[PDB]
Amino acid sequence: PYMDQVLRAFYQSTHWSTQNSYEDITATSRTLLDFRIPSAIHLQISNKSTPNTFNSLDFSTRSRINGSLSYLYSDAQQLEKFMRNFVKKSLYYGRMYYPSSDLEAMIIKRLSPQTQFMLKGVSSFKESLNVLTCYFQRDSHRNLQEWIFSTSDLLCGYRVLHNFLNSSLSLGAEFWLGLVSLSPGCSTTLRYYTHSTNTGRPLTLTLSWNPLFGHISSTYSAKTGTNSTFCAKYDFNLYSIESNLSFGCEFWQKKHHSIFTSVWKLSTSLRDKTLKLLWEGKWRGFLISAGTELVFTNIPVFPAKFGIQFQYST
Amino acid sequence: TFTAKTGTNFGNDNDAEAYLQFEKLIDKKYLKLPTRVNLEILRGTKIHSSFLFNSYSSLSPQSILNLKVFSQFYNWNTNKGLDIGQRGARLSLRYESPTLFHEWFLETCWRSTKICSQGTSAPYMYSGTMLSQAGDQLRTILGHTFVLDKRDHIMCPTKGSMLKWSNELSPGKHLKTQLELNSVKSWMNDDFITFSTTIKTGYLKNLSSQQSLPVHICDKFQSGGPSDIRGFQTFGLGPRDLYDAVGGDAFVSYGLSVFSRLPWKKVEKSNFRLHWFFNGGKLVNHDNTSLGNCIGQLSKEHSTSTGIGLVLRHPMARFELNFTLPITAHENDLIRKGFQFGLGLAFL
Amino acid sequence: DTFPLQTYAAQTDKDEAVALEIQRRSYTFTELTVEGTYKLGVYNVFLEANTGAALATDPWCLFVQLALCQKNGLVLPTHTCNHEMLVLSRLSNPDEALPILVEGYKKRIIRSTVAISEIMRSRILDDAEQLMYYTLLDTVLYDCWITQIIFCASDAQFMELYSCQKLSGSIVTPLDVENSLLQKLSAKSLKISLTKRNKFQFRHREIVKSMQGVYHNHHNSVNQEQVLNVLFENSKQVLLGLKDMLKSDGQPTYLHLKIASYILCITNVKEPIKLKTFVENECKELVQFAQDTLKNFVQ
Amino acid sequence: VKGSVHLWGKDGKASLISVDSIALVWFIKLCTSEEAKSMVAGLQIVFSNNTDLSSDGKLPVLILDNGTKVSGYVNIVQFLHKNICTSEEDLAIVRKKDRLLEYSLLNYVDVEISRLTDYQLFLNTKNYNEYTKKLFSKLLYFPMWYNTPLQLRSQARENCEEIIGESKAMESASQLAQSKTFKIAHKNKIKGKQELQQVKYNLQFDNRLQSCVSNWLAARKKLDDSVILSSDLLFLANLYVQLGLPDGNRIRSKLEQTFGSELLNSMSNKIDDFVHRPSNNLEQRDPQFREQGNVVMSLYNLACKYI
């Protein structure tokens, strides 16, 4: 999204290390595998109106001209440089989408050198839900203890991420307790950023868990190349065994003679029996993002949901 | 020179809309009158879009010809239950610390009116008045707008008055005269308390040979809303056929406003103000003979409302969150008690 | 809920130029109180030379009009709160198709064309043989009528029939100059809405796609001339077979009111659109049938 | 008459995506009488599978030695019955007194019953994904495979809509990953609403087919019930597709409760008789390089529609 990209430029400007949190812990396993394929032809232009107000617009063949009016204010005086992929700082974000007047907001207030706070409201007029969450969190050098109070029903939560000890045998958890739904939830993660001498590469062995369902997962994610990257997730389940094996082959490039950069992607799934392809090519301001999805289950190979997506911005 | 950009409309009823606007400053060979053309595309309504050409050409140091070719489609009256489309041209000539300008236009427009509400939503937009306004019309209109704005700012002022006077003559069909006063006055040190008064009157005559050719629903006056008399729904005042606001042939609309700059000191010196207002007005159909019996109607039973609230006043927009209370109303007016959200540029 | 301190009577001031336009389009079905009335919204209204009554100019609107004078025991309006027949625009509905029915005043129900089509065909749905004939008129004879009024009649014979815009005598007043300019700008926009009524845009997707377009090239014109020619050859075979289906045994069936409403609207067209030239010359028993069917609805 | 009938099939028999080509093969195969042979003599069936040779995009076209295109099954049959020489077994020619009811029946299968078979070819998720969308790979050429059943499914949705059936993503994206238990049950509130909606669609279908076959069979008993008319061949070509699809056994049962089993098996005795008849009457043809719809010929046919 763009709410989850504004969040990452505030963190890298305040040096908060979002990669040690329990929302970027299985990061490579989802950016190479569960990317979005555009389902139609698409055009988009973004701009910037006031010093603290951005504007967007898009129209596809399906939907008409949409839009959004962003607001963004922050005391972080190196913010906008990391938008493009002690002082008690702050951030205020707010965005209304206007074919439909769907709101959203975000308030960050770094209350200490090692403690934050995060409001995240999403208040849609239609499909009505005033979700209003609060993410108190106390970072340290070995933790990211992070309490969440949502307002979907009354959903409270918890997270923790204890780093151990290249060999980084990390650990995580979460313990969610719906105060109205009475439906708990848990997890565990044992990721391991390592180093090897085959190509020069990390690994990501995400030995996940969910002890209520027995829903163990896995993940392997190599970096076989100086630019390319490969991943392979093996889903599983306990007491009701039903597997999967996904894939992903994000392949980079750089071109010169503004500089053209092209990032290829694949996603071979086996339980879904599909093959997702996508090419994402940038420029100074322009960005073309095409993508197809072949389904293998005569003529089995039927490319459902082709799409291209143009985007210019500034 | 080109500046293909994107913005936000801040239009009629609280609901902003995206536009995409390509400019082109024409070079000094098809020129010696410094001309820029525009092409602004907006979201139409569900079949069509809204294209809006412009061609501003500075004739004199104080003269600008605008040639505006529009093809715009938009939703309208209360439940977005009316679909309006407009095709035509507009040749407009604008003549120049107090802002003063006169602006004469000449517009030919073909207007399609569609009842786009569903027949399950049963008596709304399906009155005898709205059933007969659906159709197609062509309409040439001549105008003159005079604006004398002695205020120091347009959206967040602190002194001075404003006078806007409009005329519209569709020849042999209707003549439409509007006035809008405004008066902003401040009494404290750093413009802390700002007392703002507005008065809008209007009058519309049917010039069409013994009351043939009715005036269209899009040409009559409407009252109510966040950007008008607050504490009533938009299209919420005036006479009605069944449940549809059929507009008025004359109106008066006033309003007070006090602002207070939020006495919490860490949030002072900002664009937020503590807002208290008293709005009100009357919308009437005036038995189209005189100007004397029209004021006997226009000053009899007003639809007033008071309320407190909090307002942001930026140069690009004015956000208004009020708690309104209808003081008086008519028995069929649309009331909107409690919280009301306002957004736009012009409030009254 | 106590807060509006004074509340006044509703407001009783009306535009008397709106009530003069509604009175100019209303035709009153002669022969109950405020809520037991309907207003049949039609496209326009013509004047019959024989009976002098106000018939509607579209074959569907005239069918629903005669089916209301049969069901309710009315007499046709001539060109104490009786029912009504409004001349409306197509754009008075989201459907943009127009026979509609405006029932009631404060509890006002609107029946669209598709709602009236389900109502009108379910009253002879119990017969299966006459439902085949009713479906043949509504598909084969309807499609010849529409293609010969959208494409084969002039843009002033179309807007005479399918528009509530004003038929001026000639171009004398500057009001009459720009009334003639509307019938040029808004002719193809009214033709496009008429091709959406009986699912004509789905039986005829290609000659409807060529209407939403410019300059009318030779490929779309030599295909339309082939589609419109087999549409007319079929309808010559429809109308010639109907002449053995005109025997009256009393009150007219909903098929006899639909054969009559196509003949009464084909013979109103002032141009030789080839359905008029065929019905006048070869179907002279159909013209005589459609006048005998009509004269039990007049006085 | 002298012409060339274009169809949808693949080189020996008409395809099941079009009941108007199936019924027209049987119509030509069953002209065995002396009078019925005269209206069919020299018709030269072509299986071109390209709709650019049509006057309206539908592909039983009769392009008849002048450029006069007659399109669709019902228009061709009424054209061929009009062009007999004028001077009982396997295809009847109805008399003057029965020409109107036989056209009324032919038109009723075209507008009411063939609206239901194009539901079952494209708007049935069991039939469209298994059978239909993998049938155009056998008929058309290399770039034009994924637009023809996609446009034909959009056409059948518009044709059967009034009888049968950006913060929205970010709303759960702060909560559903943060709840992690109804991320598994985000699809479960969709297939829990998908389940009572497809049986909601199968009831307003199956009483439309219960009424369109009841109306047709009640008007068919006014003509001669012992002889084969050209309206019977379009009715049977609608059963032969509706029963022969992947979801045909649900419909062979549903028609057997209302109309019996002595009639659904009497209709399928005529149906399987008509498919297994010899093609000695059929004089076929191969398409030329103006009738194929190649990659180079469907761009020349793409520019002429705007020129």
Dmax (CA) for chain D in angstroms is: 83
CB contact under 8 A, A53 and B5: no
Secondary-structure class of domain C18-119 per CATH: alpha beta
User: Which residues of chain A does B314 touch, with a Cβ-Cβ cutoff of 8 Å?
Assistant: 50
d(CA D232, CA D238): 10
Q: Which of A70, A8, A68 is nearest to A44 (CA)?
A: A68
Name the 3-class secondary structure at A224: coil
Q: Which of A93, A81, A4 is nearest to A54 (CA)?
A: A93
d(CA B325, CA B305): 6
Name which of A45, A49, A50 is nearest B20 (Cβ-Cβ): A45
CA-based nearest distance D224→chain A, Å: 44
Lookup: tokens for D146: 């994924």
A vs B: CB pairs below 8 A: 56
Structure determination method: cryo-EM
d(CA B49, CA C228): 33
CA-based nearest distance C282→chain D, Å: 17
Burial of residue A38 (number of CB atoms within 10 Å: 0-12, 13-18, 19+): middle
Q: Is D207 in CB contact (< 8 Å) with chain C?
A: no
Q: Taking CA atoms, what residue in C is nearest to D155? A: C202
DSSP output for A8-36? HHHHHHHT--GGGSTTSTT-HHHHTTSPP
Which residue's structure tokens are 């070869």? C282
- Dihedral angle, C-alpha D5, D7, D10, D12, nearest 10 °: -40
Q: At what angle do helices D232-244 and D19-29 cross, to 10 degrees?
A: 130
User: Exposed e or buried b for every residue in D26-63, given b needs 16+ CB within 10 A?
Assistant: bbbbbbeeeebebbbeebebbbbbbbbbbbbbbbbbbb
What kind and span of H or E run contains C263? helix C256-266
Name the 3-class secondary structure at B100: strand
Which residues is B93 bridged to in the sheet? B65, B104
Which residues is C86 bridged to in the sheet? C26, C41
CB D231 within 8 A of CB D109: yes
Q: Is A174 in CB contact (< 8 Å) with chain D?
A: yes
User: Exposed e or buried b for every residue in C39-63, given b needs 16+ CB within 10 A?
Assistant: bbbbbbbbebeebebbbbbbbbbbb
Q: Which residues contact D188 (CB under 8 A, 6 or more apart)?
A: D182
User: Which residues of chain D does A155 touch, with a Cβ-Cβ cutoff of 8 Å?
Assistant: 175, 178-179
Report residue A302 CA to chain centroid gap: 29
Give the start-end residues of each E strand in chain B: 5-8, 18-25, 35-45, 48-60, 63-75, 83-95, 99-114, 135-149, 161-170, 174-186, 194-206, 250-259, 272-284, 305-313, 318-326, 328-330, 338-344
DSSP output for C49-73? TTT-BEEESSHHHHHHHHHHHHHTT
At residue C226, φ and ψ (nearest 5 deg) are -90, -35
Q: Taking CA atoms, what residue in D is nearest to A122? A: D171
d(CA B167, CA C76): 46
Residues counted in chain D:
307
Q: Which of D85, D81, D37 is nearest to D230 (CA)?
A: D81
N-to-C CA span, chain D: 31
With respect to CATH, is domain B4-344 assigned 2.40.160.50? Answer: yes
d(CA A121, CA A135): 11
Strands B328-330 and C6-8: parallel
CB D44 within 8 A of CB D4: yes
Domains for chain A: give ranges and CATH numbers. 3-312 (2.40.160.10)
DSSP output for D86-150? ----SS----GGGHHHHHHHHHHIIIIIHHHHHIIIII-HHHIIIIITTTTTTTS-SSTTSSHHH
Name the 3-class secondary structure at D293: coil
CB B10 within 8 A of CB B42: no
Which residue's structure tokens are 């008007």? D219
Report residue B66 CA to chain centroid gap: 20
d(CA D27, CA D5): 12
CB contact under 8 A, C219 and D214: no
Q: Where are the domains of chain C?
A: 18-119
Per DSSP, chain C holds a count of helices (H) and strands (E) of: 14, 8
CA-based nearest distance C82→chain B, Å: 16
Q: What is the CA radius of gyration of chain D?
A: 22
CB B130 within 8 A of CB B82: yes
Q: Where are the domains of chain D?
A: 4-303
DSSP output for B278-344? EEEEEEE--TTS-SHHHHHHHTSS---EEEEEEEEE-SS-EEEEEEEEESEEETT-----EEEEEEE
Lookup: tokens for C297: 């609805």
CB contact under 8 A, C205 and D155: yes
d(CA C44, CA C160): 8
d(CA B78, CA D179): 40
N-to-C CA span, chain C: 57
Q: Which of B105, B78, B101 is nearest to B93 (CA)?
A: B105
d(CA D207, CA D213): 10
Name which of B129, B301, B326 is nearest C3 (Cβ-Cβ): B326
User: Which residues of chain C does D155 touch, with a Cβ-Cβ cutoff of 8 Å?
Assistant: 202, 205
CB contact under 8 A, B49 and A57: no
Which residues of chain D come before a gap where C and the next N are over 2.5 Å apart?
A: 87, 165
At residue D295, φ and ψ (nearest 5 deg) are -75, -30
What kind and span of H or E run contains A307? strand A302-307
CB contact under 8 A, C18 and B301: no
Task: Report the residue of C230, C233, C236 to disrupt the D interface, i.e. the one with the largest count of D CBs within 10 Å.
Answer: C230
**Does an interface of 3+ CB pairs under 8 Å exist between D and B?**
no
Which residues is C272 bridged to in the sheet? none
Lookup: tokens for C24: 């100019």
User: Which residues of chain B does A97 touch, with a Cβ-Cβ cutoff of 8 Å?
Assistant: none
Which residue's structure tokens are 């017969």? C127
Burial of residue C202 (number of CB atoms within 10 Å: 0-12, 13-18, 19+): middle
Integer angstrom CA distances of residue C60 from C260, C262, C263, C289, D207: 11, 8, 12, 18, 27
Which residues is B199 bridged to in the sheet? B181, B254
* CA atoms lying within 13 Å on the CB side of residue D214: 16
Name which of C128, C136, C220 is nearest D103 (Cβ-Cβ): C136
Burial of residue A86 (number of CB atoms within 10 Å: 0-12, 13-18, 19+): exposed
d(CA D174, CA D171): 7
Integer angstrom CA distances of residue A84 from A39, A257, B30: 25, 21, 41
Q: Which of A241, A200, A186, A252 is nearest to A22 (CA)?
A: A186
Which residue's structure tokens are 């769907």? A102
Q: Which residues 109-138 of B have a C-beta within 8 angstroms of C? A: 110, 112-119, 122-123, 126-129, 131-138
CB A221 within 8 A of CB A195: no
CB contact under 8 A, B215 and C185: no
CB contact under 8 A, C226 and D97: no
Q: Taking CA atoms, what residue in D is nearest to A96? A: D167
What kind and span of H or E run contains D62? strand D61-63
Integer angstrom CA distances of residue D226 from B329, C187, D91, D222, D264: 78, 52, 11, 11, 16
Lookup: tokens for B322: 């009020």
CA-based nearest distance B43→chain A, Å: 5
Task: Report the residue of A129, A273, A293 to disrupt the D interface, i.e. the one with the largest count of D CBs within 10 Å.
Answer: A129
d(CA B120, CA C97): 16
d(CA C131, CA C255): 8
Q: Is D142 in CB contact (< 8 Å) with chain A?
A: no
CB contact under 8 A, B87 and C111: no
d(CA D214, CA D305): 42
- Tell which phi-psi region holds residue D44, choosing left (phi > 0), alpha (psi between -120 and 50) or beta: left
Which residue's structure tokens are 């070819």? D121
Q: Where are the domains of chain B?
A: 4-344
Which residues is B37 bridged to in the sheet? B24, B55
- Resolution limit, Å: 3.2
d(CA B162, CA C158): 52
Name which of B138, B285, B328 is nearest C4 (Cβ-Cβ): B328
d(CA A149, CA A135): 7
Q: Which residues contact B37 (CB under 8 A, 6 or more apart)?
A: B23, B24, B26, B53, B54, B55
Q: Which residues contact B175 (CB under 8 A, 6 or more apart)?
A: B167, B168, B169, B204, B205, B207
Lookup: tokens for B33: 């009158």
Task: Report the residue of D53, D96, D103 to disrupt the C interface, i.e. the one with the largest count of C CBs within 10 Å.
Answer: D103
Which residue's structure tokens are 């403690």? A115
Sign of the dihedral through C-alpha C73, C76, C81, C85 = positive
**Does an interface of 3+ CB pairs under 8 Å exist between D and C?**
yes
Name the 3-class secondary structure at A213: coil
* CA atoms lying within 13 Å on the CB side of residue A88: 6
